[PDB]
Write a protein that binds this ligand. Structure first.
Ligand SMILES: Cc1cc2nc3c(=O)[nH]c(=O)nc-3n(C[C@H](O)[C@H](O)[C@H](O)COP(=O)(O)OP(=O)(O)OC[C@H]3O[C@@H](n4cnc5c(N)ncnc54)[C@H](O)[C@@H]3O)c2cc1C
Ligand SMILES: NC(=O)c1ccc[n+]([C@@H]2O[C@H](COP(=O)([O-])OP(=O)(O)OC[C@H]3O[C@@H](n4cnc5c(N)ncnc54)[C@H](OP(=O)(O)O)[C@@H]3O)[C@@H](O)[C@H]2O)c1
Ligand SMILES: Cc1cc2nc3c(=O)[nH]c(=O)nc-3n(C[C@H](O)[C@H](O)[C@H](O)COP(=O)(O)O)c2cc1C
Length: 607
């Protein structure tokens, strides 16, 4: 259970941990692990949450050992979910890491405020604990071209590492295919994966504790339309976690593993002219690699495409390059290569015709008829299907055995020319209580209510971003009912039209009437020529809010989009503080930002 011991038992001298939430860092970690072999070394990629990083202290036992970290940065600079434990540990510990060699590559995006905060932290932190840095901190930027940044980093990285441990490029040929196909003639039905994420049968034989690798299948006890209109579809779900031993608090997130639209799976099978019901397995050509399979096997093709692979997002340039070899028509083959190019115009065609038009693997297979790749090679080229995160909309103080979700079904007309459907939400919208089971696990956040119940709370969450706040309110109403003394509880919510998508009208009225909700400020962006947003309302309450912040010591919470809405709200607060301090804008910014570091201004960013 010690990654170090895991390394010794398989001759690995290089370990690459991935701090990832949607797979990018995971895949970079996988590619770097594979790389080690091109230099006569051996590595493995691993999820830090499945291990204890304090074990780094033992890494020096393996000669010429290296630990690499591919870390993504999320909301307010916090780490991804699978890296929180490692991150918490790095802050607690003072372990001496002399003898440890590391390298960090961080995934980020310059348009957010805390650019690669997680990557900079691990790199800086590990040096203070005494470990030795052998290659510079890579700073990838998903705003420009992340893959490109990774490549130019990696190309200097291996040479420096090879120069450090005394080896050199083996000069191997390569293999193209990292896996080979093996079809099964019989197979015991209970020896074949049917969608589980980890241990075989782990879905049928629910056995705690339940986490990311061992999700708990909760039954859907409620699923109802929340919006009055029909322009869009907003839903409220309730999953029973009774007997799961799962604990949660208001502000936490619940992640679910969805299933792709079976009609989409079918079509891909037909277009490839394949038997989606063939039970098979994909094995790593290199029998020395730690990644034996691309996903759980054996399994049918149907299962893989349904529960294990991303078939709805835009195909990566690499996929287009590989697929290219399968276009029996020259002009289509040339177009596929151009979209994979590095040329400026070649990178544009891609950005425009694939990424922005939101074309998926099936659309590409239809738009390029001469393209007929064997399904097994296709499955190896596609990325793993990721879990979708939702802000728990209930309080464990009141619903200890039920996790509530507030979500908007995703469905739009892509510029590709067809209608795209969101995976998790479509799958969730079809679950009818009649037992509909959703695989899920909980992920803690730092979006918690004040430590002391007396501290006033100011919530700003337009649209479905109100979700976590229903939790906060339930809990505050409960605290009051327990004879506790609670500070003021204000909610600033917004919607399109009151008769269209106003959420939780009744529940919100009840809380207000009962005094659990002190003020209920609602803005409607489309019910008039003039658009009204939560920040206009905050501006109208400039006196009171400033009082609660400068005197009451209120806590502020904002939920939704960070770079725009959350940005306008922050600006609005800068203005309020500048007027009532009174102080210069410059000084108002330090004051609002001091609140954040001080822990009183929390942001839960969804995008
Ligand atoms: C910490 C966190 C908390 C979250 N909490 C919630 C929550 O409480 N409620 C909720 O509803 N969601 C929440 N989300 C968003 C949520 O995780 C899902 O991404 C969302 O529900 C859609 O998932 P899907 O699988 O249905 O869509 P997918 O199949 O994953 O597709 C989503 C993608 O489609 C694209 N897209 C969407 N609409 C359009 C359009 N009109 N035109 C072009 N492209 C488009 C975008 O690139 C988008 O990323 C949260 C995200 C994070 C990171
Ligand atoms: N970047 C953003 O600021 C932003 C805001 C809302 C939604 N979205 C996206 O759209 C999808 C629908 O989400 P939803 O249903 O929960 O939201 P929604 O239905 O659009 O509701 C959010 C509310 O915020 C308003 N709004 C828009 N830009 C804003 C800003 N900068 N500051 C404050 N309020 C703003 C909206 O008005 P109008 O729509 O009438 O302009 C609306 O009344 C989501 O998947 C999300 O990614 C993005
Ligand atoms: C909700 C959300 C919040 C993000 N917040 C930040 C951030 O604060 N700073 C940053 O540098 N990058 C931020 N990013 C960008 C990601 O770090 C980048 O897209 C990374 O590649 C994702 O990697 P993954 O697939 O391995 O999780 C954010 C992305 C999302 C989706």
């Amino acid at each position: 259970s010690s990654f170090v011991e895991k390394m010794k038992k398989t001759g690995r001298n290089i370990i690459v941990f991935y701090g990832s939430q949607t797979g990018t860092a995971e895949e970079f970690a996988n590619r770097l692990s594979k790389d080690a072999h091109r230099y006569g070394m051996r590595g493995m990629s691993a999820d830090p949450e499945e291990y204890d990083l304090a074990d780094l202290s033992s890494l020096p036992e393996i000669d010429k050992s290296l630990v690499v970290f591919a870390m993504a940065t999320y909301g307010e600079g916090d780490p991804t979910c699978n890296a929180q434990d490692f991150y918490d540990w790095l802050q607690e510990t003072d372990v001496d890491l002399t003898g440890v060699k590391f390298a960090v590559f961080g995934l980020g995006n310059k348009t957010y405020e805390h650019f690669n905060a997680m990557g900079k932290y691990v790199d800086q932190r590990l040096e203070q604990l005494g470990a030795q840095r052998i290659f510079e901190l890579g700073l990838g930027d998903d705003d420009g071209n992340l893959e490109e940044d990774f490549i130019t980093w990696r190309e200097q990285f291996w040479p420096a590492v090879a120069e450090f441990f005394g080896v050199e490029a083996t000069g191997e040929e390569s293999s193209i295919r990292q896996y080979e196909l093996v079809v099964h003639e019989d197979m015991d039905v209970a020896k074949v994966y049917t969608g589980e994420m980890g241990r075989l049968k782990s879905y049928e034989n629910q056995k705690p504790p339940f986490d990311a690798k061992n999700p708990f299948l909760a039954a859907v006890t409620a699923n109802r339309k929340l919006n009055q209109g029909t322009e869009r579809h907003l839903m409220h779900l309730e999953l029973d976690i009774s007997d799961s031993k799962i604990r949660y608090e208001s502000g936490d997130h619940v992640a679910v593993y969805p299933a792709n639209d079976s009609a989409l799976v079918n079509q891909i099978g037909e277009i490839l002219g394949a038997d989606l019901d063939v039970i098979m397995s994909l094995n790593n050509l290199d029998e020395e690699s730690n990644k034996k399979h691309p996903f759980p096997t054996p399994t049918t093709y149907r299962t893989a495409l349904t529960y294990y692979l991303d078939i709805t997002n835009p195909p990566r340039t690499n996929v287009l390059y590989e697929l290219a070899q399968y276009a029996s028509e020259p002009s289509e083959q040339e177009h596929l290569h151009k979209m994979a190019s590095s040329s400026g115009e070649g990178k544009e065609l891609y950005l425009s015709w694939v990424v922005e038009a939101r074309r998926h693997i099936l659309a590409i297979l239809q738009d390029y008829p001469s393209l007929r790749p064997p399904i097994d090679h296709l499955l190896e080229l596609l990325p793993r299907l990721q879990a979708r995160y939702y802000s728990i909309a209930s309080s464990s103080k009141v619903h200890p055995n039920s996790v509530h979700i507030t979500a908007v079904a995703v469905e739009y007309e892509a510029k590709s020319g067809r209608v795209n459907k969101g995976v998790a939400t479509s799958w969730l919208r079809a679950k009818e209580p009649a037992r509909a089971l959703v695989p899920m696990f909980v992920c803690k956040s730092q979006f918690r209510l004040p430590f002391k119940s007396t501290t006033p709370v100011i919530m700003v969450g337009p649209g479905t971003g109100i979700a976590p706040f229903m939790g906060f309110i339930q809990e505050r109403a409960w605290l009051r009912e327990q004879g506790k003394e609670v500070g003021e509880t204000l909610l600033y919510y917004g919607a399109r039209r009151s008769d269209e998508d106003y959420l939780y009208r009744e529940e919100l009225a009840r809380f207000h009437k009962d005094g659990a909700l002190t003020q209920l400020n609602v803005a409607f962006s489309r019910e008039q020529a003039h658009k009204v947003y939560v920040q206009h309302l905050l501006k109208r309450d400039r006196e009171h809010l400033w009082k609660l912040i400068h005197e009451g010591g209120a806590h502020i919470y904002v939920c939704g989009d960070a770079r725009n809405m959350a940005k306008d709200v922050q600006n609005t607060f800068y203005d309020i503080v500048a007027e009532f301090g009174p102080m210069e804008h410059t000084q108002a910014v330090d004051y609002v930002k001091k609140l954040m570091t001080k822990g009183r201004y929390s942001l839960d960013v969804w995008s």
